[PDB]
Amino acid sequence: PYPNLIPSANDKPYSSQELFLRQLNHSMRTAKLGATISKVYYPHKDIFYPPLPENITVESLMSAGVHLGQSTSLWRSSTQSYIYGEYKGIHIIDLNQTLSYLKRAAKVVEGVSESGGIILFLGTRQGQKRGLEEAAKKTHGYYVSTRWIPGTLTNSTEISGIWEKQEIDSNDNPTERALSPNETSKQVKPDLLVVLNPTENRNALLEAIKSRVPTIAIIDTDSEPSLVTYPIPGNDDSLRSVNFLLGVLARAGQRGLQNRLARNNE
Amino acid sequence: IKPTAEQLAQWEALKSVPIPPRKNATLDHITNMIMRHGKKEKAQTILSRALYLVYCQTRQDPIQALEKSLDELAPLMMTKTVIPVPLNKRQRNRIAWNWIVQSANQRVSSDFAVRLGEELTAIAKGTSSAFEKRDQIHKTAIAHRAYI
Amino acid sequence: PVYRLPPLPRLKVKKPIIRQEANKCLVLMSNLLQCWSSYGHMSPKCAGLVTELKSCTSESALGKSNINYHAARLYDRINGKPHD
Amino acid sequence: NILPPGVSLPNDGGSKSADVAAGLHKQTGVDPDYITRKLTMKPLVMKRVSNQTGKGKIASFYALVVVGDKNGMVGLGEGKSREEMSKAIFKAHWDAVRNL
Amino acid sequence: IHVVPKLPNSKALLQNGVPNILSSSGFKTVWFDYQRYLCDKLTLATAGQSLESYYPFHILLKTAGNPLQSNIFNLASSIHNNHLFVENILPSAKTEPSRLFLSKIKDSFNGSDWEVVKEEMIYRAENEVLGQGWLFLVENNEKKLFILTSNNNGTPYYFPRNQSFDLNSAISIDEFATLKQMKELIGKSTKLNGKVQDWTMPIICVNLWDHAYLHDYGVGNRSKYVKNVLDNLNWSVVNNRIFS
Numbered sequence: 001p002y003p004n005l006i007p008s009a010n011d012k013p014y015s016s017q018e019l020f021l022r023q024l025n026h027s028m029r030t031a032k033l034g035a036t037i038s039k040v041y042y043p044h045k046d047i048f049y050p051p052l053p054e055n056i057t058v059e060s061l062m063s064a065g066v067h068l069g070q071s072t073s074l075w076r077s078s079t080q081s082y083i084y085g086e087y088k089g090i091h092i093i094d095l096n097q098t099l100s101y102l103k104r105a106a107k108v109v110e111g112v113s114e115s116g117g118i119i120l121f122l123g124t125r126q127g128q129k130r131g132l133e134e135a136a137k138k139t140h141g142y143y144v145s146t147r148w149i150p151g152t153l154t155n156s157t158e159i160s161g162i163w164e165k166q167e168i169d170s171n172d173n174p175t176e177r178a179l180s181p182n183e184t185s186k187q188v189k190p191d192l193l194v195v196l197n198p199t200e201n202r203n204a205l206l207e208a209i210k211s212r213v214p215t216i217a218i219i220d221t222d223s224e225p226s227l228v229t230y231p232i233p234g235n236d237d238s239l240r241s242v243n244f245l246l247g248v249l250a251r252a253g254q255r256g257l258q259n260r261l262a263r264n265n266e
Numbered sequence: 267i268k269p270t271a272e273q274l275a276q277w278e279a280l281k282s283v284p285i286p287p288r289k290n291a292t293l294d295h296i297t298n299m300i301m302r303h304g305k306k307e308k309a310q311t312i313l314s315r316a317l318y319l320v321y322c323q324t325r326q327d328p329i330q331a332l333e334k335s336l337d338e339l340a341p342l343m344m345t346k347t348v349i350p351v352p353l354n355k356r357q358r359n360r361i362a363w364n365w366i367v368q369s370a371n372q373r374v375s376s377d378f379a380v381r382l383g384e385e386l387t388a389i390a391k392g393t394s395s396a397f398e399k400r401d402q403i404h405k406t407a408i409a410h411r412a413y414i
Numbered sequence: 415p416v417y418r419l420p421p422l423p424r425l426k427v428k429k430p431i432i433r434q435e436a437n438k439c440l441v442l443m444s445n446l447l448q449c450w451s452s453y454g455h456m457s458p459k460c461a462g463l464v465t466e467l468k469s470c471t472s473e474s475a476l477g478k479s480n481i482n483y484h485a486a487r488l489y490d491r492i493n494g495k496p497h498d
Numbered sequence: 499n500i501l502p503p504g505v506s507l508p509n510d511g512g513s514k515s516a517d518v519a520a521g522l523h524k525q526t527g528v529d530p531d532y533i534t535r536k537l538t539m540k541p542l543v544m545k546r547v548s549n550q551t552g553k554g555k556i557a558s559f560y561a562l563v564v565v566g567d568k569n570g571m572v573g574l575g576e577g578k579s580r581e582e583m584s585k586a587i588f589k590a591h592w593d594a595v596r597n598l
Numbered sequence: 599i600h601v602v603p604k605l606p607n608s609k610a611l612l613q614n615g616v617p618n619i620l621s622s623s624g625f626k627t628v629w630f631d632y633q634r635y636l637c638d639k640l641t642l643a644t645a646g647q648s649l650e651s652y653y654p655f656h657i658l659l660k661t662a663g664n665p666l667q668s669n670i671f672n673l674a675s676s677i678h679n680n681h682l683f684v685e686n687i688l689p690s691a692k693t694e695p696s697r698l699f700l701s702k703i704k705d706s707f708n709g710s711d712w713e714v715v716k717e718e719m720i721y722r723a724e725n726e727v728l729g730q731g732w733l734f735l736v737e738n739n740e741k742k743l744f745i746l747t748s749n750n751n752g753t754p755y756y757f758p759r760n761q762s763f764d765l766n767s768a769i770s771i772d773e774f775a776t777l778k779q780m781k782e783l784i785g786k787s788t789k790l791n792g793k794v795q796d797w798t799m800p801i802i803c804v805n806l807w808d809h810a811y812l813h814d815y816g817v818g819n820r821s822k823y824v825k826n827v828l829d830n831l832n833w834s835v836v837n838n839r840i841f842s
């Protein structure tokens with residue numbers, strides 16, 4: 001439990017570490033006494049307990065702030081059909097269209113994960129690393145959050161060719177087989193690319209277009225809907241909305257992975 | 267190692283004291299100014315002998331008298347090309363020492379130590395022409411203050 | 415009224431001006447010189463100020479603008495150019 | 499023998515179509531056999547283009563080629579090479595295969 | 599929304615309440631009615647604020663040092679203390695006092711055995727706690743137990759808010775000295791909030807509020823209620839609360 005700890009003698013008072021363990025024991029048992037908190041938003045849960053696509057309501061999407069679009073002065077008129085209206089100097093996104101597009105994109109992610117494809121979560125804004133990493137880990141996928149190197153797809157040999165690759169079974173179990181140099185030097189291309197900030201990742205979208213990689217993205221009021229295969233109308237500048245949508249997609253991918261493993265284990 | 271009683275007592279007693287100075291900065295700087303050709307000991311002998319005459323004719327600490335003299339004679343600021351500029355301790359000491367050395371060289375003794383010691387004795391008694399030089403420098407600084 | 419500049423190649427100040435603080439030694443010297451100008455040289459009145467100078471310059475006689483960087487960094491965000 | 503751990507000399511280890519097919523399969527996953535067997539290339543434009551520079555005039559070779567399997571797939575590729583025209587044709591073939 | 603915690607064996611407690619201390623009607627007053635009352639008041643007080651996200655114990659630890667939200671603190675304190683009280687009187691999660699707790703009482707109370715200490719706690723509750731209050735057996739950082747009493751809603755954790763001295767009446771000069779040293783301890787800290795460290799924890803809690811005993815034991819005879827509480831405690835919880 002807590003090795004390399006030297007308890008104190010009964011005559012002497014508690015030590016700092018003994019006090020820490022005493023307070024930990026208190027916290028895990030009695031600190032939570034008196035009431036149970038209900039109907040309160042805790043940000044971390046948005047990453048760790050995302051809802052299923054079918055359980056999402058318009059109220060839940062509005063609570064996450066998905067509806068809040070860009071300023072009316074920065075409007076991209078090609079996004080007219082996704083807009084419910086304008087309010088307080090900003091455009092409001094139609095959350096029913098958002099719900100439909102999000103369910104469709106979640107089905108796409110679930111199908112791709114169930115087929116064993118490679119899913120890449122690209123988001124390069126400040127505090128998006130946590131959700132991206134968790135989505136990649138629970139979908140058995142991959143993620144980028146520092147910077148998208150241009151040419152990562154169209155120039156894969158000169159960018160990603162040096163990093164190591166791995167053969168795996170139907171159950172995602174390492175086989176530890178030795179790969180030939182030609183096999184190691186092939187391009188490994190994502191089967192699905194999801195972008196949280198498509199406005200700042202035009203290079204990735206264009207590379208996916210050139211390389212025929214279907215792509216999902218959160219299309220804000222100032223973003224181009226036609227640059228992506230499966231747009232999701234929603235707010236991309238709020239971390240809560242981005243994490244909510246990303247958690248939904250990641251849970252869909254996890255469900256697909258679980259279905260794949262269940263079928264392989266029967 | 268566990269320090270024994272004497273070692274810890276020594277450590278406490280000493281840490282309760284400051285470190286001694288290696289050298290008196292002012293006296294060392296004056297000596298180096300007297301120095302030529304790397305003959306430090308000759309300069310030290312000359313300076314100590316002059317200070318010894320200063321004591322023998324004044325019977326007060328001659329190191330203190332020398333510093334009173336350098337502090338009072340030396341100009342605080344000087345006009346340069348025309349704006350005044352402040353002077354730090356070493357520059358003031360150098361100017362004062364040069365003024366002292368001229369008046370010393372004006373004296374009669376064949377030994378430079380005797381001339382320097384008697385000049386320092388006269389300065390310690392408030393008798394020197396270098397006060398006029400200091401006054402002129404300060405007057406010029408006052409005249410040209412506007413160009414700071 | 416508000417004036418909107420065109421899409422510009424850059425947003426940069428030709429000569430950024432920095433607020434260097436005048437040295438304490440210089441102003442103390444100026445005050446001493448004014449003291450000796452009014453009361454007189456080696457006057458009893460302001461002699462105390464001399465002591466300060468004697469300390470302030472004892473060790474040494476005298477004892478940065480990032481506007482262009484931030485402007486270049488932020489210009490693409492704030493210029494308000496039309497979409498494309 | 500003193501061979502390094504991995505040699506890479508295909509004749510001493512102890513054309514355009516083949517290299518194009520191999521590099522394309524390595525970089526994009528295209529099938530080499532289809533490229534080598536089914537595709538046919540005809541150079542359309544072949545010229546020399548020059549650039550002035552303070553030290554001197556620099557010459558380069560431009561090639562524009564069209565590839566196709568004659569069954570509904572056609573692609574255009576352009577290649578530049580300062581060294582030789584053959585390398586320009588190679589790059590044009592590469593690009594044309596990429597633009598099918 | 600702070601909600602009343604669910605209790606084990608809730609149906610049995612509704613039917614009869616805690617055996618040998620409270621009847622069903624009394625247990626309704628002490629827990630089902632009073633805890634709901636306190637939780638609803640805390641929710642009304644703290645809704646739309648940060649404090650809705652924190653548990654009552656973390657609320658009172660946060661709010662102990664600020665004068666103007668004492669009401670919230672009071673509610674939080676009660677909402678904590680009441681539950682603590684309930685947990686030491688629940689029929690079960692016969693439980694016996696542990697060897698470690700007996701050793702600590704013997705060592706902490708100058709060799710006195712546990713039962714005379716129970717009688718001493720009865721005496722303390724009868725004497726100092728005039729009206730509403732809380733009684734605790736608490737351990738300090740020195741592994742020493744002692745008996746603490748709080749007037750109205752007070753907390754054992756933070757000694758500035760112990761509320762162990764009733765200033766409505768007089769105070770002994772020793773109590774005034776204790777108050778002055780306590781205030782000096784508070785003032786010494788360099789923190790802007792003025793917080794101080796106190797590692798005291800409650801091992802035993804008894805509810806001297808009128809909600810607990812008035813319906814079952816009358817205006818008087820509170821010491822009878824305290825004796826009944828102490829005799830028939832749930833010793834599993836009490837033993838767990840101590841750290842070894």
Ligand SMILES: [Mg+2]
Nearest residue numbers: 070220236237
């Ligand atoms: Mg945006």
